[PDB]
Amino acid sequence: PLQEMLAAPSSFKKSHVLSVTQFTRADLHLLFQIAQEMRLGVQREGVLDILRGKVLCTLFYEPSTRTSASFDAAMQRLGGRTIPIQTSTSKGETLQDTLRTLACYSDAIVLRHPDEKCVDVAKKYCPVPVINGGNGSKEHPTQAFLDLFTIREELGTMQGLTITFVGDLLYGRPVHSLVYLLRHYQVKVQLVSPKALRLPPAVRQQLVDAGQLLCESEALTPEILGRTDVLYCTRVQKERFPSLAEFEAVKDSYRIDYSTLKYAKPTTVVMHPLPRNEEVAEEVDFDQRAAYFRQMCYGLYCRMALLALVMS
Amino acid sequence: PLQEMLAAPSSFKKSHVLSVTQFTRADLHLLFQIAQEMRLGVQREGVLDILRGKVLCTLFYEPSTRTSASFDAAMQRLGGRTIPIQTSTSKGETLQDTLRTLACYSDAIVLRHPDEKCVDVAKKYCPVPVINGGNGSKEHPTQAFLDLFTIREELGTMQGLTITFVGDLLYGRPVHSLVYLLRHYQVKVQLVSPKALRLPPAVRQQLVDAGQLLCESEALTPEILGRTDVLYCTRVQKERFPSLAEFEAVKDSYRIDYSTLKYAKPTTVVMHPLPRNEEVAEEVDFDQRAAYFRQMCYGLYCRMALLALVMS
Amino acid sequence: PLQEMLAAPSSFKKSHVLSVTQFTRADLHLLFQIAQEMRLGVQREGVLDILRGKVLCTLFYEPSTRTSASFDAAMQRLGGRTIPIQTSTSKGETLQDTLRTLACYSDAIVLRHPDEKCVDVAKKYCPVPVINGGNGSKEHPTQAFLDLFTIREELGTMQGLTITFVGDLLYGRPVHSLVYLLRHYQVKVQLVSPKALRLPPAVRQQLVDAGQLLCESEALTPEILGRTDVLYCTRVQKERFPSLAEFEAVKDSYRIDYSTLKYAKPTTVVMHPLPRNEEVAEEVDFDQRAAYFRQMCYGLYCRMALLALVMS
């Protein structure tokens, strides 16, 4: 059955994966279908036989253990091989020289780089598929895929859901990517954020265009929480505020702990792309609704399906 | 035959491997039996087919090439897959967040961490087996296993042996772990150490309880050496002494070179957990009795058998 | 057919690969033959089944992504396993201790080390084959092999060729190694270099002995370029010159860009061992004659064949 799905046509095949804007609702539906079978296969066989003759390089100019190890494990559980490039402390060879070098060894490269334009360098020069693992934190498409997959799997549907984004919605680009992916579905969105860290006007206008913008609030109210199906939290960082007083104030209001979960639904899904500071208290980690570690498991099967589609 | 042994019941199966205190004489006998077959299998096939669908993460917060590469090679020679997590220079994500992340990718994690309590964090939070590769140097259970295996294999038995521990017996915790493992057998122990760096009273009292304590000496005498079956050396570090004069004095007395081996038995086994400074001179490396590199080979088969038992 | 070639006798089998001076014209002919089949196999199967039960360690004391990842990918595309040792920032264990440790885990080690004498340490102490990935930049034998292979493959022959070495021919040791490998063939050599950075007298005298030295020039003339079949460029580094003025002067004269390629042949092969600074302009990267990335692909198949011969 996975064989049939992977034989089906896809925009992923032999393609760079650089932006969520490349892919359709149909593309993601197939990805999630294959992801579902990837999980069943792994439960049965552990290491599958899909990409046995393929080699993936991972090329992370800044470390992200959660992302790089996810791709390594996905590739190896597809039966493929991985070559993780040591992240140097360096000044060094140009990105395009390194990519063209590694393209002689591997069939695809996962690239994470602090320059947003790194995706344009990859497009111009790299003769094998490049998967964007983070381009100056502008986009992180497989994080967007796994976030959406997490919602679908935790709550079973997409229609009728209310999603509450809380924290730094200006710098929290995973929110923007997920807002783009949500344009097809009949959802409602609540934006809880300091006034300084609200969504960029273009992303807000995306929600307006879709008839999805429900409420905008500085405060994480019992009322907002009471109607939340998905509480998607972002990291609030001190550099976003000139004064410490304001920074700690906003943190204390937004901290997700038992004091705030008591206003949520029994079925609210608490999500966080991670790393976290203290915006989600450790005391809630064992709560049913704490889904930010299931998120990582969902990402494995999503990236297995992505790698299968790209390199098969 | 390995298949039969691995089908046999074991305390290792699906278990954390955190302390030598978890396991019995029977547990270790089975481990060593399987280790013996692991060596035969490797000699015949190089890479076996025991853990083909399993994935091991190695998570070393401080480097130990001898330990991490041993586990990587053992896992891969079992036919499994390995994901070695780059040791960062970092301040970073909490240990429990990282473990729960990597548990979504792998079936077991080998963890080395500078906090002794890291084993308690792993117990509370990690939903897959964690193997302790060193917890603030308090314990290193697979080092204890391979040390004991080395003795069994080099000398053929455990009964009637005299073991001489030399060096820093206060901070040299591999000695303490091995003393615990030796409680079942009819051995005699000689402790050669500066008075400041003698065994902790509890560990000494362990030897007394077992009727194994033979002699305690500041000097590495021709008499002590003449009755030594196993000379287990530890690193003496300058920080253990306020003055340089005392540090160099103790080093010169304890240095194992041809000048000191001439008093040993033709069959004395010279062991060292490594890394070494100068307490074992390079001139003895090619001597039959120099077993600290065979130790590493023995560790490979011991860790192959451990990984097989835990994850099969 | 690869099976027959690999069954054929070879100086590579079970041997250290430390210097180009170890191997004959016959040895290299077989290597290149096998390399050719390695490429066909990879095109068909991606990952072959030649070294399925073998384990390669890569041990790089200074990073060289192009070299270490090439060996990793070659080993894995032979169906073998790889254990890449993290390059530390460290003061640490002696080289011989580390090698003897890793020899207990792997069947061969690729070693790159800043001490030229590291090859002598490996010879004395390491009980498995060591492949020299760079010994204080004195030798880099597999780079020499792939350079020669690149010429053979790009131009089809070795007889009648004119090779032009340009840049730092004093510190550019890949030139010296390639000059040694070229002693069998009827080639002519042009040496374009500043007078301070000319070839060492012994290497020049090698070319004289072989009846291959054609011309020595400070300037990269239209005449020299017009007769060049292979333009092998080396990096010119500022430390080679006391004054910046001279350094930039020599760089501007030697920079390979369209302004200089217009004097070359339509068939001139532009080679560079890499990394490059600006001595080969990015504008020529898409030119047919720009072979420094095909070089890397050729290196993969060369190292596949080398690893097959050593460890089969």
From TrEMBL, chains A, B, C:
Q: Which family does it belong to?
A: In the N-terminal section; belongs to the CarA family.
Role:
Multifunctional protein that encodes the first 2 enzymatic activities of the de novo pyrimidine pathway: carbamoylphosphate synthetase (CPSase; EC 6.3.5.5) and aspartate transcarbamylase (ATCase; EC 2.1.3.2). The CPSase-function is accomplished in 2 steps, by a glutamine-dependent amidotransferase activity (GATase) that binds and cleaves glutamine to produce ammonia, followed by an ammonium-dependent carbamoyl phosphate synthetase, which reacts with the ammonia, hydrogencarbonate and ATP to form carbamoyl phosphate.
Origin: domain of life = Eukaryota
* Protein name per the record: Pyrimidine-specific carbamoyl phosphate synthase-aspartate carbamoyl transferase
